[PDB]
Amino acid sequence: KAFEKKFRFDYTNERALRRTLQEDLVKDVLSNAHIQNELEREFERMREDREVLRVIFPTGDSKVVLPCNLLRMIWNAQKIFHINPRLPSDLHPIKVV
Amino acid sequence: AGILFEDIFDVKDIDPEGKKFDRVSRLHCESESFKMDLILDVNIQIYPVDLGDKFRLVIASTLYEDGTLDDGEYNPTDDRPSRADQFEYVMYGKVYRIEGDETSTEAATRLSAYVSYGGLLMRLQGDANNLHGFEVDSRVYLLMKKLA
Amino acid sequence: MNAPPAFESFLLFEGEKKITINKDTKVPNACLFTINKEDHTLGNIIKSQLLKDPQVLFAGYKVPHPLEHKIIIRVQTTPDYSPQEAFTNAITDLISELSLLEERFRVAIKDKQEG
Amino acid sequence: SNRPVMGIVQDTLTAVRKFTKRDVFLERGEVMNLLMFLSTWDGKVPQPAILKPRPLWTGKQIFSLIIPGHINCIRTHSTHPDDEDSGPYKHISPGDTKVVVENGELIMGILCKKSLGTSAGSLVHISYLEMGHDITRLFYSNIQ
């Protein structure tokens, strides 16, 4: 339940949509169907990766060693581009995918 | 103007947990007519404060009494603009976090702005309507003056 | 074997200049003075006197290595005033203070003995 | 072991903690000296934290000038309790633990072996991985 809530991208409530994504993007998200199909396929791929991870790492250890520090890169991007977290953004989730 | 906030506070505690530092004490003030809690660290050696004191707090984005910003570069030989020198205690910090009472759908009704004055922190909770002048990474001045 | 002679800490050799003036290109109206064969005995007085001047915005000194005798002084001043003028005024004021101090000490000695 | 093999050793390390306490307020002349010993300094003296009734800087306000570039990091002091992260004052930290470096400025926290030391993810490790050897070398020298 926590995994689905954290990684699902509910596109139905539409109030979270108006609060987080911009107005010209929320109408696009609510109108298109190819966007919705891609967004559901992304979560399907994430679920399969979750099962693969659980097979590779029993005993539930998250700590791992990998080459790129994604969270610190995201923090640097936020500070470099003066991102304000209190406002809706202009990033299209299809562009993200 | 450039005055983001202005209110009169009363000191309720000086160190509820204990004396953590020799020359720094953490005031726990509460507002009047605004109902805005404050948690401020004040150099007490230079500016002594004791219980029950009332001071007028002003938080301004500039000191120059006309609107122009300062660029953050120190210069003492600039008395020409006649800065806001009617206060006793002045600090200079950078707001680093604006917590809120948001949710998935409803917007926020109470905010909490944190400012770091080169180590000496400050949290200023209250209503979300009079706390709108604060944006993160923005330089902010603090001005205090004890009322007799 | 590798011991430098003791007199090398205060004697300028053939070719060495006592003081050389260089500008600082990072900030306007800044200048660096390099003094050879000196130490804190002069650096501290000159710095503390430069700080008294209200038209001096920066004034410091440092010894880059304790085994090599050389003093670097950096002073930045407000426009319509030059760091060379600030330096010369500082030295003149120090000399005046020392002369007055010597006069008063001599008169105090005279008062103390046979008086 | 993909960790920095060299770090601050015990004398700058016993003194950076005292420098980075909250109480350290520096006079104008002391700031002049310390900036005179900075090799990667722009040339502009930052605005003092305490501006009235006497201009006073702070140890963190100068370690911010020492820290290079725009480095973002979050460490934890060696005397950080097990209740601050849970209860209130999570981001206020009464004892001045929970080191935070945003945009190359030491916003809060006390620096110790767990921040400047030879451990993974420390401030020096982040400085290396972000800026390179040529800037980490100056980092070490300026700190010392």
Swiss-Prot record, chain A:
Component of the RNA polymerase II (Pol II) core complex consisting of 12 subunits: a ten-subunit catalytic core composed of POLR2A/RPB1, POLR2B/RPB2, POLR2C/RPB3, POLR2I/RPB9, POLR2J/RPB11, POLR2E/RPABC1, POLR2F/RPABC2, POLR2H/RPABC3, POLR2K/RPABC4 and POLR2L/RPABC5 and a mobile stalk composed of two subunits POLR2D/RPB4 and POLR2G/RPB7, protruding from the core and functioning primarily in transcription initiation. Part of Pol II(G) complex, in which Pol II core associates with an additional subunit POLR2M; unlike conventional Pol II, Pol II(G) functions as a transcriptional repressor. Catalytic core component of RNA polymerase II (Pol II), a DNA-dependent RNA polymerase which synthesizes mRNA precursors and many functional non-coding RNAs using the four ribonucleoside triphosphates as substrates. Pol II-mediated transcription cycle proceeds through transcription initiation, transcription elongation and transcription termination stages. RNA-dependent RNA polymerase that catalyzes the extension of a non-coding RNA (ncRNA) at the 3'-end using the four ribonucleoside triphosphates as substrates. An internal ncRNA sequence near the 3'-end serves as a template in a single-round Pol II-mediated RNA polymerization reaction. May decrease the stability of ncRNAs that repress Pol II-mediated gene transcription. The chain holds residues 914 to 1010 of 1970 of the full protein. Belongs to the RNA polymerase beta' chain family. Signal peptide: none annotated. The lineage of its organism: Eukaryota, Metazoa, Chordata, Craniata, Vertebrata. This is DNA-directed RNA polymerase II subunit RPB1. It comes from the Eukaryota. Disulfide bonds: none annotated. It is found in: Nucleus; Cytoplasm; Chromosome.
Swiss-Prot record, chain B:
It is found in: Nucleus; Nucleus, Nucleolus. It comes from the Eukaryota. One of its GO terms (cellular component) is RNA polymerase II, core complex. GO terms for biological process: transcription by RNA polymerase II. Pfam families: RNA_pol_Rpb8. One of its GO terms (molecular function) is DNA-directed RNA polymerase activity. The modification N-acetylalanine is found at A1. Component of the RNA polymerase I (Pol I), RNA polymerase II (Pol II) and RNA polymerase III (Pol III) complexes consisting of at least 13, 12 and 17 subunits, respectively. Pol I complex consists of a ten-subunit catalytic core composed of POLR1A/RPA1, POLR1B/RPA2, POLR1C/RPAC1, POLR1D/RPAC2, POLR1H/RPA12, POLR2E/RPABC1, POLR2F/RPABC2, POLR2H/RPABC3, POLR2K/RPABC4 and POLR2L/RPABC5; a mobile stalk subunit POLR1F/RPA43 protruding from the core and additional subunits homologous to general transcription factors POLR1E/RPA49 and POLR1G/RPA34. Belongs to the eukaryotic RPB8 RNA polymerase subunit family. DNA-dependent RNA polymerase catalyzes the transcription of DNA into RNA using the four ribonucleoside triphosphates as substrates. Common component of RNA polymerases I, II and III which synthesize ribosomal RNA precursors, mRNA precursors and many functional non-coding RNAs, and small RNAs, such as 5S rRNA and tRNAs, respectively. This is DNA-directed RNA polymerases I, II, and III subunit RPABC3.
UniProtKB/Swiss-Prot annotation, chain C:
GO terms for biological process: transcription by RNA polymerase II. It is found in: Nucleus. Transmembrane segments: none annotated. Pfam families: RNA_pol_L_2 (PF13656). Gene3D superfamilies: RNA polymerase, RBP11-like subunit (3.30.1360.10). InterPro entries: RBP11, RBP11-like, RBP11-like_dimer, RNA_pol_Rpb11_13-16kDa_CS, Rpo11-like. The modification N-acetylmethionine is found at M1. GO terms for molecular function: DNA binding; DNA-directed RNA polymerase activity; protein dimerization activity. Keywords: Acetylation, DNA-directed RNA polymerase, Nucleus, Transcription. PROSITE patterns: RNA_POL_L_13KD. GO terms for cellular component: nucleus; RNA polymerase II, core complex. Its main location: nucleus. DNA-dependent RNA polymerase catalyzes the transcription of DNA into RNA using the four ribonucleoside triphosphates as substrates. Component of RNA polymerase II which synthesizes mRNA precursors and many functional non-coding RNAs. Pol II is the central component of the basal RNA polymerase II transcription machinery. It is composed of mobile elements that move relative to each other. POLR2J/RPB11 is part of the core element with the central large cleft. Belongs to the archaeal Rpo11/eukaryotic RPB11/RPC19 RNA polymerase subunit family. Component of the RNA polymerase II (Pol II) core complex consisting of 12 subunits: a ten-subunit catalytic core composed of POLR2A/RPB1, POLR2B/RPB2, POLR2C/RPB3, POLR2I/RPB9, POLR2J/RPB11, POLR2E/RPABC1, POLR2F/RPABC2, POLR2H/RPABC3, POLR2K/RPABC4 and POLR2L/RPABC5 and a mobile stalk composed of two subunits POLR2D/RPB4 and POLR2G/RPB7, protruding from the core and functioning primarily in transcription initiation. Part of Pol II(G) complex, in which Pol II core associates with an additional subunit POLR2M; unlike conventional Pol II, Pol II(G) functions as a transcriptional repressor. This is DNA-directed RNA polymerase II subunit RPB11. It comes from Bos taurus.
